[PDB]
Design a protein around this ligand. Structure first.
Ligand SMILES: Cc1c(Cl)cccc1Nc1ccccc1C(=O)O
Ligand SMILES: Cc1c(Cl)cccc1Nc1ccccc1C(=O)O
Ligand SMILES: Cc1c(Cl)cccc1Nc1ccccc1C(=O)O
Lengths: 176, 176, 176
Protein backbone atom coordinates (compact mmCIF):
# COMPACT_ATOMS: atom_id res chain seq x y z
CA UNK A 1 0.00 0.00 0.00
CA UNK A 2 2.21 2.81 1.30
CA UNK A 3 5.55 1.33 0.26
CA UNK A 4 3.99 -0.36 -2.78
CA UNK A 5 2.31 2.64 -4.45
CA UNK A 6 5.35 4.79 -3.65
CA UNK A 7 7.66 2.22 -5.25
CA UNK A 8 5.69 2.36 -8.51
CA UNK A 9 6.02 6.16 -8.63
CA UNK A 10 9.81 6.20 -8.35
CA UNK A 11 9.84 3.30 -10.82
CA UNK A 12 7.88 5.25 -13.43
CA UNK A 13 9.82 8.41 -12.55
CA UNK A 14 13.24 6.91 -13.29
CA UNK A 15 11.76 5.04 -16.27
CA UNK A 16 10.45 8.26 -17.81
CA UNK A 17 13.88 9.76 -17.11
CA UNK A 18 15.43 7.01 -19.24
CA UNK A 19 13.07 7.86 -22.11
CA UNK A 20 14.08 11.53 -21.95
CA UNK A 21 17.85 10.94 -22.00
CA UNK A 22 18.84 7.28 -22.35
CA UNK A 23 22.49 8.17 -21.70
CA UNK A 24 21.83 9.71 -18.30
CA UNK A 25 23.67 8.20 -15.34
CA UNK A 26 21.81 7.55 -12.08
CA UNK A 27 23.54 8.04 -8.74
CA UNK A 28 23.02 5.98 -5.59
CA UNK A 29 20.72 8.64 -4.12
CA UNK A 30 18.48 8.59 -7.20
CA UNK A 31 18.04 4.80 -7.00
CA UNK A 32 17.75 4.69 -3.20
CA UNK A 33 13.90 4.46 -3.06
CA UNK A 34 14.14 1.30 -5.20
CA UNK A 35 17.20 -0.21 -3.50
CA UNK A 36 16.07 0.24 0.12
CA UNK A 37 12.55 -1.10 -0.47
CA UNK A 38 11.65 -4.24 1.49
CA UNK A 39 9.01 -5.34 -1.03
CA UNK A 40 9.25 -8.93 -2.35
CA UNK A 41 11.21 -9.69 -5.50
CA UNK A 42 8.06 -10.36 -7.54
CA UNK A 43 6.79 -6.88 -6.63
CA UNK A 44 10.00 -4.99 -7.44
CA UNK A 45 10.85 -6.82 -10.69
CA UNK A 46 7.74 -7.09 -12.86
CA UNK A 47 9.41 -7.89 -16.21
CA UNK A 48 12.99 -8.98 -15.49
CA UNK A 49 13.10 -12.59 -14.24
CA UNK A 50 15.46 -11.72 -11.41
CA UNK A 51 14.70 -14.97 -9.57
CA UNK A 52 15.82 -17.23 -12.41
CA UNK A 53 18.75 -14.99 -13.36
CA UNK A 54 20.27 -15.29 -9.88
CA UNK A 55 19.18 -18.84 -9.03
CA UNK A 56 20.28 -20.44 -12.32
CA UNK A 57 23.73 -18.80 -12.25
CA UNK A 58 24.66 -19.03 -8.54
CA UNK A 59 27.45 -21.54 -9.12
CA UNK A 60 30.76 -21.26 -7.32
CA UNK A 61 31.69 -18.35 -5.09
CA UNK A 62 29.33 -15.34 -4.96
CA UNK A 63 32.27 -13.00 -5.53
CA UNK A 64 32.60 -14.56 -8.99
CA UNK A 65 29.04 -15.30 -10.12
CA UNK A 66 27.66 -11.98 -8.85
CA UNK A 67 30.31 -10.34 -11.04
CA UNK A 68 29.49 -12.55 -14.04
CA UNK A 69 25.80 -11.66 -13.69
CA UNK A 70 26.38 -7.94 -13.11
CA UNK A 71 28.64 -7.61 -16.16
CA UNK A 72 26.09 -9.42 -18.33
CA UNK A 73 23.40 -7.04 -17.06
CA UNK A 74 25.67 -4.08 -17.86
CA UNK A 75 25.73 -5.26 -21.48
CA UNK A 76 21.95 -5.76 -21.47
CA UNK A 77 21.50 -2.30 -19.94
CA UNK A 78 23.40 -0.77 -22.87
CA UNK A 79 21.16 -2.59 -25.37
CA UNK A 80 18.08 -1.04 -23.75
CA UNK A 81 19.59 2.45 -23.64
CA UNK A 82 20.50 2.24 -27.33
CA UNK A 83 16.86 1.52 -28.22
CA UNK A 84 15.78 4.70 -26.39
CA UNK A 85 18.50 6.90 -27.91
CA UNK A 86 17.52 9.70 -30.31
CA UNK A 87 20.13 8.33 -32.75
CA UNK A 88 19.56 4.58 -32.60
CA UNK A 89 22.31 2.20 -33.79
CA UNK A 90 22.13 1.06 -37.40
CA UNK A 91 21.61 -2.63 -36.50
CA UNK A 92 19.25 -2.00 -33.57
CA UNK A 93 16.74 -4.43 -35.11
CA UNK A 94 18.79 -7.52 -34.24
CA UNK A 95 21.51 -8.95 -32.02
CA UNK A 96 24.00 -11.59 -33.19
CA UNK A 97 25.02 -14.36 -30.79
CA UNK A 98 28.56 -14.46 -32.22
CA UNK A 99 29.31 -10.91 -31.05
CA UNK A 100 32.48 -11.16 -28.90
CA UNK A 101 31.07 -8.98 -26.12
CA UNK A 102 27.75 -10.84 -26.16
CA UNK A 103 29.40 -14.27 -26.16
CA UNK A 104 31.72 -13.47 -23.24
CA UNK A 105 29.11 -11.65 -21.10
CA UNK A 106 25.42 -12.28 -21.87
CA UNK A 107 25.80 -15.80 -23.27
CA UNK A 108 27.80 -16.74 -20.15
CA UNK A 109 24.56 -16.44 -18.13
CA UNK A 110 21.56 -18.74 -18.42
CA UNK A 111 18.59 -16.50 -19.16
CA UNK A 112 20.65 -13.70 -20.68
CA UNK A 113 19.07 -14.22 -24.11
CA UNK A 114 15.59 -14.01 -22.57
CA UNK A 115 16.22 -10.42 -21.46
CA UNK A 116 16.58 -9.41 -25.11
CA UNK A 117 13.11 -10.82 -25.79
CA UNK A 118 11.69 -8.41 -23.21
CA UNK A 119 13.14 -5.55 -25.27
CA UNK A 120 11.45 -6.87 -28.41
CA UNK A 121 13.99 -9.29 -29.91
CA UNK A 122 11.29 -11.95 -30.02
CA UNK A 123 12.06 -13.46 -33.46
CA UNK A 124 14.56 -16.31 -33.14
CA UNK A 125 17.25 -16.90 -35.77
CA UNK A 126 19.91 -19.64 -35.92
CA UNK A 127 22.54 -17.08 -34.86
CA UNK A 128 20.66 -14.33 -33.04
CA UNK A 129 17.41 -12.64 -32.12
CA UNK A 130 15.68 -9.81 -33.95
CA UNK A 131 12.64 -7.56 -33.85
CA UNK A 132 9.64 -8.62 -35.94
CA UNK A 133 10.01 -7.35 -39.50
CA UNK A 134 6.59 -5.71 -39.23
CA UNK A 135 7.59 -3.60 -36.22
CA UNK A 136 8.70 -0.10 -37.24
CA UNK A 137 9.76 1.24 -33.83
CA UNK A 138 10.35 -0.40 -30.44
CA UNK A 139 7.92 0.04 -27.56
CA UNK A 140 9.56 2.95 -25.75
CA UNK A 141 7.74 2.29 -22.47
CA UNK A 142 8.30 -1.48 -22.55
CA UNK A 143 12.00 -0.96 -23.33
CA UNK A 144 12.39 1.72 -20.65
CA UNK A 145 10.80 -0.33 -17.87
CA UNK A 146 12.94 -3.37 -18.74
CA UNK A 147 16.07 -1.21 -18.94
CA UNK A 148 15.35 0.17 -15.46
CA UNK A 149 14.99 -3.29 -13.92
CA UNK A 150 18.23 -4.43 -15.57
CA UNK A 151 19.98 -1.34 -14.19
CA UNK A 152 18.34 -1.86 -10.79
CA UNK A 153 19.38 -5.52 -10.55
CA UNK A 154 22.93 -4.76 -11.74
CA UNK A 155 23.15 -2.00 -9.12
CA UNK A 156 21.90 -4.41 -6.45
CA UNK A 157 24.56 -6.97 -7.38
CA UNK A 158 27.25 -4.28 -7.58
CA UNK A 159 26.42 -2.87 -4.14
CA UNK A 160 26.45 -6.39 -2.67
CA UNK A 161 29.95 -7.02 -4.02
CA UNK A 162 31.00 -3.64 -2.60
CA UNK A 163 29.46 -4.44 0.83
CA UNK A 164 27.35 -1.27 0.51
CA UNK A 165 23.86 -2.63 -0.16
CA UNK A 166 21.14 -1.07 2.03
CA UNK A 167 19.83 -4.61 2.69
CA UNK A 168 23.27 -6.25 2.52
CA UNK A 169 22.73 -8.46 5.57
CA UNK A 170 19.29 -9.63 4.42
CA UNK A 171 20.41 -10.46 0.88
CA UNK A 172 23.61 -12.20 1.98
CA UNK A 173 21.48 -14.64 3.98
CA UNK A 174 19.87 -15.68 0.67
CA UNK A 175 23.26 -16.86 -0.63
CA UNK A 176 24.61 -18.67 2.46
CA UNK B 1 25.65 -39.80 -36.23
CA UNK B 2 25.97 -43.47 -35.31
CA UNK B 3 25.25 -42.96 -31.61
CA UNK B 4 22.42 -40.57 -32.50
CA UNK B 5 20.61 -43.29 -34.47
CA UNK B 6 21.13 -45.80 -31.65
CA UNK B 7 19.69 -43.37 -29.09
CA UNK B 8 16.54 -42.73 -31.13
CA UNK B 9 15.65 -46.40 -31.66
CA UNK B 10 16.18 -47.05 -27.95
CA UNK B 11 14.13 -44.00 -26.95
CA UNK B 12 11.26 -45.02 -29.23
CA UNK B 13 11.35 -48.59 -27.89
CA UNK B 14 11.08 -47.67 -24.21
CA UNK B 15 8.43 -45.08 -25.07
CA UNK B 16 6.46 -47.83 -26.83
CA UNK B 17 6.94 -50.03 -23.76
CA UNK B 18 5.60 -47.17 -21.63
CA UNK B 19 2.49 -46.92 -23.81
CA UNK B 20 2.19 -50.72 -23.81
CA UNK B 21 2.38 -50.93 -20.00
CA UNK B 22 2.67 -47.65 -18.10
CA UNK B 23 3.08 -49.45 -14.77
CA UNK B 24 6.08 -51.63 -15.66
CA UNK B 25 9.49 -51.08 -14.10
CA UNK B 26 12.66 -50.57 -16.15
CA UNK B 27 15.91 -52.02 -14.84
CA UNK B 28 19.29 -50.38 -15.35
CA UNK B 29 19.87 -53.01 -18.06
CA UNK B 30 16.88 -51.82 -20.09
CA UNK B 31 18.09 -48.22 -19.61
CA UNK B 32 21.81 -48.71 -20.34
CA UNK B 33 21.59 -47.67 -24.05
CA UNK B 34 20.39 -44.28 -22.73
CA UNK B 35 22.42 -44.06 -19.51
CA UNK B 36 25.84 -45.11 -20.93
CA UNK B 37 25.15 -42.64 -23.72
CA UNK B 38 27.85 -40.15 -24.69
CA UNK B 39 25.77 -37.61 -26.63
CA UNK B 40 25.51 -34.10 -25.11
CA UNK B 41 22.69 -33.27 -22.71
CA UNK B 42 20.86 -31.29 -25.40
CA UNK B 43 20.66 -34.44 -27.55
CA UNK B 44 19.41 -36.77 -24.80
CA UNK B 45 16.64 -34.53 -23.40
CA UNK B 46 14.70 -33.01 -26.29
CA UNK B 47 11.77 -31.65 -24.25
CA UNK B 48 12.56 -31.95 -20.53
CA UNK B 49 14.52 -28.84 -19.56
CA UNK B 50 17.17 -30.88 -17.74
CA UNK B 51 19.67 -28.01 -17.88
CA UNK B 52 17.45 -25.57 -15.97
CA UNK B 53 16.07 -28.24 -13.62
CA UNK B 54 19.58 -28.94 -12.33
CA UNK B 55 21.22 -25.51 -12.58
CA UNK B 56 18.33 -23.54 -11.07
CA UNK B 57 18.06 -25.97 -8.13
CA UNK B 58 21.76 -26.71 -7.43
CA UNK B 59 21.87 -24.82 -4.13
CA UNK B 60 23.61 -26.25 -1.08
CA UNK B 61 25.09 -29.75 -0.96
CA UNK B 62 24.73 -32.14 -3.93
CA UNK B 63 23.68 -34.91 -1.53
CA UNK B 64 20.66 -32.77 -0.61
CA UNK B 65 19.53 -31.02 -3.79
CA UNK B 66 20.01 -34.12 -5.94
CA UNK B 67 17.61 -35.83 -3.53
CA UNK B 68 15.10 -32.98 -3.81
CA UNK B 69 15.30 -33.18 -7.60
CA UNK B 70 15.00 -36.98 -7.68
CA UNK B 71 11.87 -37.05 -5.52
CA UNK B 72 10.23 -34.28 -7.56
CA UNK B 73 11.02 -36.24 -10.72
CA UNK B 74 9.62 -39.40 -9.13
CA UNK B 75 6.31 -37.59 -8.60
CA UNK B 76 6.35 -36.16 -12.13
CA UNK B 77 7.06 -39.60 -13.59
CA UNK B 78 3.99 -41.01 -11.83
CA UNK B 79 1.88 -38.21 -13.32
CA UNK B 80 2.96 -39.19 -16.83
CA UNK B 81 2.48 -42.91 -16.22
CA UNK B 82 -1.05 -42.27 -14.94
CA UNK B 83 -1.85 -40.43 -18.18
CA UNK B 84 -0.93 -43.55 -20.18
CA UNK B 85 -2.67 -46.07 -17.92
CA UNK B 86 -5.83 -47.86 -19.09
CA UNK B 87 -7.52 -47.06 -15.76
CA UNK B 88 -6.80 -43.34 -15.86
CA UNK B 89 -7.40 -41.44 -12.60
CA UNK B 90 -10.73 -39.64 -12.48
CA UNK B 91 -8.89 -36.31 -12.01
CA UNK B 92 -6.18 -36.84 -14.63
CA UNK B 93 -7.24 -33.64 -16.40
CA UNK B 94 -5.89 -31.30 -13.71
CA UNK B 95 -3.25 -30.93 -11.02
CA UNK B 96 -3.83 -28.82 -7.90
CA UNK B 97 -0.94 -26.80 -6.49
CA UNK B 98 -2.16 -27.29 -2.90
CA UNK B 99 -2.01 -31.09 -3.18
CA UNK B 100 0.28 -32.15 -0.30
CA UNK B 101 2.41 -34.51 -2.40
CA UNK B 102 2.78 -31.98 -5.23
CA UNK B 103 3.48 -29.06 -2.88
CA UNK B 104 6.24 -30.84 -0.93
CA UNK B 105 7.98 -32.31 -4.01
CA UNK B 106 7.27 -30.77 -7.44
CA UNK B 107 6.66 -27.27 -6.07
CA UNK B 108 9.92 -27.51 -4.10
CA UNK B 109 12.01 -27.25 -7.30
CA UNK B 110 12.06 -24.37 -9.76
CA UNK B 111 10.74 -25.59 -13.10
CA UNK B 112 8.65 -28.41 -11.64
CA UNK B 113 5.39 -26.88 -12.85
CA UNK B 114 6.82 -26.51 -16.36
CA UNK B 115 7.21 -30.29 -16.65
CA UNK B 116 3.45 -30.75 -16.23
CA UNK B 117 2.97 -28.37 -19.17
CA UNK B 118 4.95 -30.80 -21.33
CA UNK B 119 2.42 -33.48 -20.36
CA UNK B 120 -0.40 -31.23 -21.60
CA UNK B 121 -1.30 -29.26 -18.45
CA UNK B 122 -1.11 -25.99 -20.38
CA UNK B 123 -4.13 -24.10 -18.99
CA UNK B 124 -3.17 -22.18 -15.85
CA UNK B 125 -5.52 -21.18 -13.03
CA UNK B 126 -4.75 -19.66 -9.61
CA UNK B 127 -5.30 -23.13 -8.10
CA UNK B 128 -3.42 -25.33 -10.57
CA UNK B 129 -2.86 -26.44 -14.14
CA UNK B 130 -5.31 -28.37 -16.30
CA UNK B 131 -5.74 -29.82 -19.76
CA UNK B 132 -7.63 -27.79 -22.38
CA UNK B 133 -11.37 -28.32 -21.99
CA UNK B 134 -11.62 -29.49 -25.60
CA UNK B 135 -8.80 -32.04 -25.47
CA UNK B 136 -10.62 -35.37 -25.17
CA UNK B 137 -7.54 -37.57 -24.66
CA UNK B 138 -3.90 -36.86 -23.79
CA UNK B 139 -1.18 -36.87 -26.43
CA UNK B 140 0.05 -40.44 -25.98
CA UNK B 141 3.27 -39.98 -27.96
CA UNK B 142 4.06 -36.68 -26.21
CA UNK B 143 3.33 -38.02 -22.72
CA UNK B 144 5.37 -41.19 -23.28
CA UNK B 145 8.32 -39.19 -24.61
CA UNK B 146 8.35 -36.77 -21.67
CA UNK B 147 7.72 -39.57 -19.16
CA UNK B 148 10.75 -41.45 -20.51
CA UNK B 149 12.92 -38.33 -20.23
CA UNK B 150 11.73 -37.74 -16.65
CA UNK B 151 12.51 -41.35 -15.75
CA UNK B 152 15.92 -41.01 -17.42
CA UNK B 153 16.87 -37.87 -15.49
CA UNK B 154 15.64 -39.32 -12.19
CA UNK B 155 17.67 -42.48 -12.84
CA UNK B 156 20.78 -40.40 -13.56
CA UNK B 157 20.44 -38.44 -10.32
CA UNK B 158 19.67 -41.61 -8.34
CA UNK B 159 22.68 -43.48 -9.74
CA UNK B 160 24.88 -40.46 -8.99
CA UNK B 161 23.72 -40.44 -5.37
CA UNK B 162 24.36 -44.21 -5.26
CA UNK B 163 27.88 -43.72 -6.71
CA UNK B 164 26.98 -46.11 -9.55
CA UNK B 165 26.57 -43.81 -12.56
CA UNK B 166 28.35 -45.02 -15.72
CA UNK B 167 30.00 -41.59 -16.04
CA UNK B 168 30.00 -40.86 -12.30
CA UNK B 169 33.47 -39.29 -12.30
CA UNK B 170 32.72 -37.13 -15.34
CA UNK B 171 29.40 -35.84 -13.97
CA UNK B 172 30.75 -35.21 -10.47
CA UNK B 173 33.31 -32.81 -11.97
CA UNK B 174 30.33 -30.80 -13.28
CA UNK B 175 29.21 -30.12 -9.68
CA UNK B 176 32.51 -28.71 -8.36
CA UNK C 1 12.68 -50.18 32.30
CA UNK C 2 16.42 -49.70 32.75
CA UNK C 3 16.95 -49.46 28.97
CA UNK C 4 16.17 -45.76 29.49
CA UNK C 5 19.34 -45.20 31.54
CA UNK C 6 21.29 -46.96 28.78
CA UNK C 7 19.60 -44.59 26.34
CA UNK C 8 20.48 -41.63 28.58
CA UNK C 9 24.14 -42.66 28.94
CA UNK C 10 24.49 -42.98 25.17
CA UNK C 11 22.41 -39.83 24.61
CA UNK C 12 24.58 -37.78 26.96
CA UNK C 13 27.72 -39.28 25.41
CA UNK C 14 26.74 -38.29 21.87
CA UNK C 15 25.30 -34.97 23.09
CA UNK C 16 28.51 -34.01 24.90
CA UNK C 17 30.38 -35.28 21.83
CA UNK C 18 28.44 -32.80 19.69
CA UNK C 19 29.54 -29.80 21.76
CA UNK C 20 33.19 -30.90 21.89
CA UNK C 21 33.35 -31.16 18.09
CA UNK C 22 30.21 -30.30 16.10
CA UNK C 23 31.75 -31.42 12.81
CA UNK C 24 32.53 -35.04 13.68
CA UNK C 25 30.14 -37.60 12.23
CA UNK C 26 28.78 -40.66 14.05
CA UNK C 27 29.17 -44.18 12.69
CA UNK C 28 26.27 -46.62 12.51
CA UNK C 29 27.82 -48.62 15.36
CA UNK C 30 27.99 -45.55 17.62
CA UNK C 31 24.26 -44.87 17.16
CA UNK C 32 23.16 -48.53 17.33
CA UNK C 33 22.30 -48.31 21.09
CA UNK C 34 19.60 -45.77 20.21
CA UNK C 35 18.55 -47.17 16.82
CA UNK C 36 17.73 -50.66 18.13
CA UNK C 37 16.16 -49.47 21.39
CA UNK C 38 12.68 -50.85 22.07
CA UNK C 39 11.71 -47.73 24.04
CA UNK C 40 8.56 -45.92 22.87
CA UNK C 41 8.84 -42.87 20.64
CA UNK C 42 7.80 -40.47 23.41
CA UNK C 43 10.73 -41.71 25.52
CA UNK C 44 13.43 -41.55 22.82
CA UNK C 45 12.52 -38.05 21.56
CA UNK C 46 12.02 -35.56 24.39
CA UNK C 47 12.04 -32.28 22.42
CA UNK C 48 11.79 -33.06 18.70
CA UNK C 49 8.14 -33.64 17.78
CA UNK C 50 8.97 -36.82 15.89
CA UNK C 51 5.35 -38.01 15.96
CA UNK C 52 4.04 -34.92 14.17
CA UNK C 53 7.03 -34.67 11.81
CA UNK C 54 6.18 -38.09 10.39
CA UNK C 55 2.38 -38.14 10.74
CA UNK C 56 1.70 -34.65 9.37
CA UNK C 57 3.91 -35.35 6.32
CA UNK C 58 3.03 -38.99 5.52
CA UNK C 59 1.31 -38.23 2.21
CA UNK C 60 1.86 -40.39 -0.84
CA UNK C 61 4.32 -43.25 -1.03
CA UNK C 62 6.69 -43.72 1.95
CA UNK C 63 9.66 -43.95 -0.43
CA UNK C 64 8.96 -40.30 -1.30
CA UNK C 65 7.86 -38.59 1.91
CA UNK C 66 10.51 -40.35 4.00
CA UNK C 67 13.07 -38.87 1.60
CA UNK C 68 11.50 -35.41 1.91
CA UNK C 69 11.59 -35.62 5.70
CA UNK C 70 15.12 -37.04 5.81
CA UNK C 71 16.50 -34.22 3.65
CA UNK C 72 14.77 -31.57 5.77
CA UNK C 73 16.30 -33.12 8.89
CA UNK C 74 19.72 -33.14 7.20
CA UNK C 75 19.40 -29.37 6.76
CA UNK C 76 18.05 -28.94 10.29
CA UNK C 77 20.93 -31.03 11.66
CA UNK C 78 23.40 -28.70 9.94
CA UNK C 79 21.75 -25.68 11.58
CA UNK C 80 22.27 -27.24 15.00
CA UNK C 81 25.91 -28.16 14.34
CA UNK C 82 26.68 -24.63 13.15
CA UNK C 83 25.30 -23.18 16.39
CA UNK C 84 27.71 -25.34 18.44
CA UNK C 85 30.73 -24.69 16.22
CA UNK C 86 33.64 -22.68 17.66
CA UNK C 87 33.74 -20.66 14.42
CA UNK C 88 30.04 -19.85 14.30
CA UNK C 89 28.58 -18.57 11.01
CA UNK C 90 28.27 -14.79 11.00
CA UNK C 91 24.49 -14.99 10.43
CA UNK C 92 23.73 -17.63 13.08
CA UNK C 93 21.24 -15.29 14.78
CA UNK C 94 18.51 -15.77 12.16
CA UNK C 95 17.19 -17.90 9.32
CA UNK C 96 15.48 -16.46 6.23
CA UNK C 97 12.47 -18.24 4.74
CA UNK C 98 13.58 -17.17 1.24
CA UNK C 99 16.90 -19.01 1.52
CA UNK C 100 16.90 -21.45 -1.44
CA UNK C 101 18.07 -24.44 0.60
CA UNK C 102 15.62 -23.73 3.43
CA UNK C 103 12.67 -23.16 1.09
CA UNK C 104 13.12 -26.46 -0.76
CA UNK C 105 13.88 -28.66 2.28
CA UNK C 106 12.71 -27.41 5.70
CA UNK C 107 9.73 -25.45 4.38
CA UNK C 108 8.59 -28.46 2.34
CA UNK C 109 7.72 -30.22 5.62
CA UNK C 110 5.06 -29.18 8.13
CA UNK C 111 6.76 -28.70 11.48
CA UNK C 112 10.16 -27.83 10.01
CA UNK C 113 10.04 -24.25 11.28
CA UNK C 114 9.17 -25.55 14.76
CA UNK C 115 12.50 -27.40 14.92
CA UNK C 116 14.29 -24.07 14.44
CA UNK C 117 12.31 -22.72 17.40
CA UNK C 118 13.68 -25.53 19.58
CA UNK C 119 17.19 -24.37 18.63
CA UNK C 120 16.39 -20.83 19.78
CA UNK C 121 14.87 -19.13 16.72
CA UNK C 122 11.77 -18.08 18.64
CA UNK C 123 11.26 -14.50 17.40
CA UNK C 124 9.11 -14.52 14.25
CA UNK C 125 9.35 -11.94 11.46
CA UNK C 126 7.75 -11.88 8.00
CA UNK C 127 11.18 -12.66 6.50
CA UNK C 128 12.14 -15.52 8.83
CA UNK C 129 12.99 -16.56 12.37
CA UNK C 130 15.70 -15.08 14.58
CA UNK C 131 17.15 -15.38 18.06
CA UNK C 132 16.03 -12.84 20.67
CA UNK C 133 18.31 -9.81 20.55
CA UNK C 134 19.20 -10.17 24.24
CA UNK C 135 20.60 -13.69 23.85
CA UNK C 136 24.36 -13.28 23.47
CA UNK C 137 24.99 -17.01 22.96
CA UNK C 138 22.77 -19.99 22.14
CA UNK C 139 21.79 -22.63 24.68
CA UNK C 140 24.60 -25.11 24.02
CA UNK C 141 22.94 -27.83 26.11
CA UNK C 142 19.52 -27.33 24.52
CA UNK C 143 20.88 -27.16 20.97
CA UNK C 144 22.99 -30.31 21.41
CA UNK C 145 19.97 -32.25 22.66
CA UNK C 146 17.80 -31.12 19.73
CA UNK C 147 20.64 -31.66 17.24
CA UNK C 148 21.20 -35.23 18.45
CA UNK C 149 17.47 -35.97 18.19
CA UNK C 150 17.36 -34.51 14.67
CA UNK C 151 20.38 -36.64 13.76
CA UNK C 152 18.72 -39.69 15.33
CA UNK C 153 15.44 -39.29 13.42
CA UNK C 154 17.23 -38.67 10.11
CA UNK C 155 19.32 -41.81 10.62
CA UNK C 156 16.16 -43.78 11.44
CA UNK C 157 14.45 -42.61 8.25
CA UNK C 158 17.55 -43.10 6.10
CA UNK C 159 18.07 -46.64 7.42
CA UNK C 160 14.41 -47.43 6.73
CA UNK C 161 14.85 -46.29 3.13
CA UNK C 162 17.95 -48.53 2.89
CA UNK C 163 16.07 -51.55 4.33
CA UNK C 164 18.70 -51.72 7.10
CA UNK C 165 16.84 -50.40 10.15
CA UNK C 166 17.24 -52.66 13.22
CA UNK C 167 13.44 -52.56 13.67
CA UNK C 168 12.64 -52.29 9.95
CA UNK C 169 9.69 -54.69 9.87
CA UNK C 170 8.14 -53.27 13.05
CA UNK C 171 8.34 -49.71 11.72
CA UNK C 172 7.12 -50.68 8.24
CA UNK C 173 3.94 -52.05 9.84
CA UNK C 174 3.22 -48.48 11.00
CA UNK C 175 3.18 -47.15 7.41
CA UNK C 176 1.12 -49.82 5.60
C1 LIG D 1 18.04 -9.25 -5.31
C2 LIG D 1 19.03 -10.32 -4.92
C3 LIG D 1 20.41 -10.18 -5.14
CL1 LIG D 1 20.98 -8.62 -5.93
C4 LIG D 1 21.40 -11.10 -4.82
C5 LIG D 1 20.95 -12.29 -4.21
C6 LIG D 1 19.59 -12.50 -3.97
C7 LIG D 1 18.57 -11.55 -4.30
N1 LIG D 1 17.21 -11.83 -4.02
C8 LIG D 1 16.42 -12.98 -4.50
C9 LIG D 1 16.92 -13.75 -5.59
C10 LIG D 1 16.25 -14.86 -6.10
C11 LIG D 1 15.03 -15.24 -5.55
C12 LIG D 1 14.50 -14.51 -4.48
C13 LIG D 1 15.17 -13.39 -3.94
C14 LIG D 1 14.53 -12.59 -2.72
O1 LIG D 1 14.97 -11.45 -2.50
O2 LIG D 1 13.63 -13.15 -2.08
C1 LIG E 1 22.79 -35.22 -16.13
C2 LIG E 1 23.38 -34.46 -14.97
C3 LIG E 1 23.23 -34.89 -13.65
CL1 LIG E 1 22.28 -36.44 -13.36
C4 LIG E 1 23.73 -34.25 -12.51
C5 LIG E 1 24.46 -33.07 -12.74
C6 LIG E 1 24.65 -32.59 -14.04
C7 LIG E 1 24.13 -33.24 -15.20
N1 LIG E 1 24.35 -32.70 -16.49
C8 LIG E 1 24.03 -31.34 -16.95
C9 LIG E 1 22.98 -30.64 -16.30
C10 LIG E 1 22.61 -29.35 -16.67
C11 LIG E 1 23.28 -28.69 -17.70
C12 LIG E 1 24.32 -29.34 -18.36
C13 LIG E 1 24.72 -30.66 -18.00
C14 LIG E 1 25.92 -31.37 -18.77
O1 LIG E 1 26.37 -32.42 -18.27
O2 LIG E 1 26.32 -30.85 -19.82
C1 LIG F 1 10.36 -43.56 14.27
C2 LIG F 1 9.54 -43.78 13.02
C3 LIG F 1 10.10 -43.72 11.75
CL1 LIG F 1 11.90 -43.36 11.65
C4 LIG F 1 9.44 -43.90 10.54
C5 LIG F 1 8.06 -44.18 10.64
C6 LIG F 1 7.44 -44.26 11.88
C7 LIG F 1 8.13 -44.07 13.12
N1 LIG F 1 7.44 -44.15 14.35
C8 LIG F 1 6.36 -43.27 14.81
C9 LIG F 1 6.09 -42.08 14.08
C10 LIG F 1 5.07 -41.19 14.45
C11 LIG F 1 4.29 -41.45 15.58
C12 LIG F 1 4.53 -42.61 16.31
C13 LIG F 1 5.55 -43.53 15.96
C14 LIG F 1 5.79 -44.84 16.83
O1 LIG F 1 6.79 -45.52 16.55
O2 LIG F 1 4.98 -45.09 17.72
Amino acid sequence: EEEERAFLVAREELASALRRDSGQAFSLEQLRPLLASSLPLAARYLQLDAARLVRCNAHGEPRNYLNTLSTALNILEKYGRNLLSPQRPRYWRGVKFNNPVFRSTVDAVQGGRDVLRLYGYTEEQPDGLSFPEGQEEPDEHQVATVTLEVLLLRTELSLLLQNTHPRQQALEQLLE
